[PDB]
């Protein structure tokens, strides 16, 4: 339970545990476990060292937590330093893809100020 540099949980099935990797959801998790050949309903606790090692290799073949953070943050910074419309929206902390901001922009603006 030390895949990709995190401490993926015990007592959870393989899919649910590998969901905890920042960059692996349900689909990528099941793809990794299928490539590794293990049944999907078995806990991480009862996975042997070699099986965990091939899981680590496949996760490394995919993108990992800190790496994914690095590219997503550089893409955001790329938008900002281009100063496109999306760069302006990211800088301002307003919705970027064209939602209404007269109302319903709270998840992007934070709670109401006054």
């Amino acid at each position: 339970a030390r895949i990709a540099g995190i401490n993926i949980p015990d007592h959870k099935h393989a899919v649910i545990a590998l969901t905890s990797i920042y960059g692996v959801g349900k689909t990528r998790s099941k793809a990794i476990l299928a490539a590794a050949g293990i049944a999907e309903d078995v806990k991480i606790s009862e996975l042997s060292e070699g099986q965990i090692d091939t899981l680590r290799d496949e996760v490394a073949k995919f993108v990992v937590e800190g790496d994914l953070r690095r590219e997503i943050s550089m893409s955001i910074k790329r938008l900002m330093d281009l100063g496109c419309y999306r760069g302006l929206r990211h800088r301002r902390g307003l919705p970027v893809r064209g939602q209404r901001t007269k109302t319903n922009a709270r998840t992007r603006k934070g709670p109401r100020k006054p």
Partner: protein, 82 residues
């Protein structure tokens, strides 16, 4: 976005202006209205003035602005605050 089978989009007048500028032009910013035209690597190093509704904002092309149309870098709604 625009599909791959159709290729990117660019206004033909913009193509002619950019081609003329790169082959025999270092004079003046290219006054363009096509906010819908994708940026190609031909217009690198140009300083084109793109319309945003009332005036032409200058935008200087850089190595990374690739899959962006000219309107991405021209604001249309001035807003200071409240």
């Amino acid at each position: 976005p625009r599909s791959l089978k159709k290729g990117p989009f660019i206004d033909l007048h913009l193509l002619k202006k950019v081609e003329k500028a790169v082959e025999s032009g270092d004079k003046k910013p290219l006054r363009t209205w096509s906010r819908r035209s994708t940026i190609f690597p031909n217009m690198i190093g140009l300083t084109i003035a793109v319309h945003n509704g009332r005036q032409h904002v200058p935008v200087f092309v850089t190595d990374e602005m690739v899959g962006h149309k000219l309107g991405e870098f021209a604001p249309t709604r001035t807003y200071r605050g409240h």
